[PDB]
Amino acid sequence: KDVPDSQQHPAPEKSSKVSEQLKCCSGILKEMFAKKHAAYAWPFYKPVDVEALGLHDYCDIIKHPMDMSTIKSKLEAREYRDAQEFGADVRLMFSNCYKYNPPDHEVVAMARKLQDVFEMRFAKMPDE
């Protein structure tokens, strides 16, 4: 066991670093909810209405469902421990359509371009 005497980024109060990174993540979802992205990301904003498509096996495949509404909620509550976590659950729902739907299919194609803007948006992580 080794105690980290260097906390990477020494912050006053409690943990300024984590807050600044998560706030950037809020900036991301705020944009991903913007009407410009709503043209194609509309199915990801809210949990898919399974009745509408007439699926018969979402829970049988999708063991870790996530949606852009719920994820933002937890972010607003700041239950997220850092940026690594935020990126994980966003890619959760994106990869959900990927494994359950063939890569040439609609949702995964829409997610494909979301993944693009998302990847760049998450690349905007300052350290100091």
Partner: peptide, 16 residues
């Protein structure tokens, strides 16, 4: 019915 995936989206116009 096309089960086993999300075969039922509204992209442009599912017709042709």
């Amino acid at each position: 019915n096309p089960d086993g995936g999300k075969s039922g989206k509204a992209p442009r116009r599912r017709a042709v």
